[PDB]
Design a protein around this motif. Structure first.
Motif, mmCIF file in Angstrom:
data_model
loop_
_atom_site.group_PDB
_atom_site.id
_atom_site.type_symbol
_atom_site.label_atom_id
_atom_site.label_comp_id
_atom_site.label_asym_id
_atom_site.label_seq_id
_atom_site.Cartn_x
_atom_site.Cartn_y
_atom_site.Cartn_z
ATOM 1 N N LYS A 32 -38.510 72.347 -74.879
ATOM 2 C CA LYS A 32 -37.667 73.201 -74.050
ATOM 3 C C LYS A 32 -38.434 74.342 -73.389
ATOM 4 N N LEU A 33 -39.527 74.774 -74.012
ATOM 5 C CA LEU A 33 -40.332 75.853 -73.448
ATOM 6 C C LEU A 33 -40.962 75.457 -72.118
ATOM 7 N N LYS A 34 -41.193 74.159 -71.937
ATOM 8 C CA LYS A 34 -41.796 73.627 -70.713
ATOM 9 C C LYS A 34 -43.039 74.409 -70.302
ATOM 10 N N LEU A 35 -43.889 74.684 -71.286
ATOM 11 C CA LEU A 35 -45.124 75.426 -71.072
ATOM 12 C C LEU A 35 -46.321 74.496 -71.006
ATOM 13 N N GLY A 36 -46.097 73.231 -71.333
ATOM 14 C CA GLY A 36 -47.177 72.268 -71.301
ATOM 15 C C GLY A 36 -46.851 71.025 -72.091
ATOM 16 N N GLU A 37 -47.723 70.032 -71.992
ATOM 17 C CA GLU A 37 -47.538 68.779 -72.703
ATOM 18 C C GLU A 37 -47.555 69.018 -74.213
ATOM 19 N N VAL A 38 -46.640 68.373 -74.930
ATOM 20 C CA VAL A 38 -46.598 68.503 -76.382
ATOM 21 C C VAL A 38 -47.573 67.460 -76.911
ATOM 22 N N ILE A 39 -48.647 67.933 -77.531
ATOM 23 C CA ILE A 39 -49.691 67.073 -78.061
ATOM 24 C C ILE A 39 -49.508 66.800 -79.545
ATOM 25 N N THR A 40 -49.600 65.529 -79.917
ATOM 26 C CA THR A 40 -49.474 65.137 -81.310
ATOM 27 C C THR A 40 -50.850 64.857 -81.891
ATOM 28 N N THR A 41 -51.186 65.555 -82.969
ATOM 29 C CA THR A 41 -52.462 65.361 -83.646
ATOM 30 C C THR A 41 -52.172 65.058 -85.107
ATOM 31 N N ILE A 42 -52.947 64.145 -85.682
ATOM 32 C CA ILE A 42 -52.766 63.761 -87.070
ATOM 33 C C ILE A 42 -54.107 63.968 -87.769
ATOM 34 N N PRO A 43 -54.416 65.220 -88.149
ATOM 35 C CA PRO A 43 -55.677 65.550 -88.824
ATOM 36 C C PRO A 43 -55.865 64.830 -90.154
ATOM 37 N N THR A 44 -54.756 64.393 -90.738
ATOM 38 C CA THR A 44 -54.771 63.680 -92.009
ATOM 39 C C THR A 44 -53.564 62.754 -91.997
ATOM 40 N N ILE A 45 -53.766 61.481 -92.321
ATOM 41 C CA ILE A 45 -52.643 60.546 -92.301
ATOM 42 C C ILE A 45 -51.407 61.093 -93.003
ATOM 43 N N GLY A 46 -50.275 61.052 -92.305
ATOM 44 C CA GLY A 46 -49.035 61.550 -92.874
ATOM 45 C C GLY A 46 -48.758 63.009 -92.548
ATOM 46 N N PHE A 47 -49.721 63.674 -91.918
ATOM 47 C CA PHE A 47 -49.559 65.078 -91.557
ATOM 48 C C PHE A 47 -49.545 65.185 -90.041
ATOM 49 N N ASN A 48 -48.348 65.180 -89.463
ATOM 50 C CA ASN A 48 -48.193 65.254 -88.016
ATOM 51 C C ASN A 48 -48.051 66.683 -87.523
ATOM 52 N N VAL A 49 -48.942 67.060 -86.610
ATOM 53 C CA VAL A 49 -48.960 68.401 -86.033
ATOM 54 C C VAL A 49 -48.741 68.325 -84.525
ATOM 55 N N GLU A 50 -47.842 69.158 -84.007
ATOM 56 C CA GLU A 50 -47.586 69.196 -82.568
ATOM 57 C C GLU A 50 -48.136 70.510 -82.029
ATOM 58 N N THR A 51 -48.802 70.448 -80.879
ATOM 59 C CA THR A 51 -49.389 71.636 -80.270
ATOM 60 C C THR A 51 -49.092 71.742 -78.777
ATOM 61 N N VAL A 52 -49.023 72.975 -78.285
ATOM 62 C CA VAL A 52 -48.790 73.232 -76.874
ATOM 63 C C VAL A 52 -49.756 74.363 -76.557
ATOM 64 N N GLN A 53 -50.521 74.196 -75.483
ATOM 65 C CA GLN A 53 -51.489 75.194 -75.062
ATOM 66 C C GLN A 53 -51.145 75.633 -73.649
ATOM 67 N N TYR A 54 -50.844 76.914 -73.489
ATOM 68 C CA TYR A 54 -50.526 77.464 -72.183
ATOM 69 C C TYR A 54 -51.450 78.655 -71.990
ATOM 70 N N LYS A 55 -52.452 78.493 -71.131
ATOM 71 C CA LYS A 55 -53.415 79.556 -70.892
ATOM 72 C C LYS A 55 -53.999 79.992 -72.229
ATOM 73 N N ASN A 56 -53.759 81.236 -72.627
ATOM 74 C CA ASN A 56 -54.292 81.725 -73.894
ATOM 75 C C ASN A 56 -53.263 81.738 -75.016
#
Ligand SMILES: Nc1nc2c(ncn2[C@@H]2O[C@H](COP(=O)(O)OP(=O)(O)O)[C@@H](OP(=O)(O)O)[C@H]2O)c(=O)[nH]1
Ligand SMILES: [Mg+2]
Length: 177
Positions: A32-56
């Motif tokens: 909903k923030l529409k600040l950027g693409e929601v990126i899915t990263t799985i640093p460890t199997i079973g641990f799903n992390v979502e990230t959004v990077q907007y400028k800084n």
């Protein structure tokens, strides 16, 4: 892609951690923030992390729960966090005790000691939900000491309250190099 967060966030570096129980509405908030693409990263199997990077501005999001077994990696993210957003499903009284337990554990984490605390009392569009005042009491927010905190009523579906909360966060967040 949303609106004026550029003026708010400007060019400062806010490293935000947004957590809460599954079902609270965190993923909905990110989109909903529409600040950027929601990126899915799985640093460890079973641990799903979502990230959004907007400028800084960076948002790191993952689901927490009462039976969580914290890992070293979690604390790595903690050390790099300047502000914490804890999302609450205001309409889930059956799990508010669990949210309290999880949030209290986080409030006692050495690696999160300097993070300002923003609580999103989400799903406020449902009349049968708990009020922000009720959630404030149940979570024990008033007992918090030596740490800025704020609770904001939100409806992640419509985006209502999201700006107001992030505004407080931007004005109170303490930067750490
Ligand atoms: N009424 C209401 N619902 C909300 C709000 N925010 C998120 N939701 C709903 O809550 C469910 C969980 O949201 P989601 O963002 O996936 O949660 P999470 O990522 O914290 O686990 C979704 O229901 P579904 O599975 O049915 O799509 C979603 O549409 C809100 O402000 N009001
Ligand atoms: Mg999610």
């Amino acid at each position: 892609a949303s609106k004026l967060f550029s003026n708010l966030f400007g060019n400062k570096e806010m490293r935000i951690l947004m957590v809460g129980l599954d079902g609270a509405g965190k993923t909905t908030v990110l989109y909903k923030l529409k600040l950027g693409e929601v990126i899915t990263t799985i640093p460890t199997i079973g641990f799903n992390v979502e990230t959004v990077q907007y400028k800084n501005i960076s948002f790191t999001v993952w689901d927490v729960g009462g039976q969580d077994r914290i890992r070293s990696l979690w604390r790595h993210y903690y050390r790099n966090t300047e502000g914490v957003i804890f999302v609450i499903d205001s309409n889930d009284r059956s799990r508010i005790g669990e949210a309290r337990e999880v949030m209290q554990r986080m409030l006692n984490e050495d690696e999160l000691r300097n993070a300002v605390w923003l609580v999103f009392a989400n799903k406020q569009d449902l009349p049968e939900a708990m009020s922000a005042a009720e959630i404030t009491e149940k979570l024990g927010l008033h007992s918090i000491r030596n740490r800025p905190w704020f609770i904001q009523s939100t409806c992640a579906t419509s985006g209502e309250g999201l700006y107001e909360g992030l505004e407080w966060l931007s004005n109170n967040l303490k930067n750490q190099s």
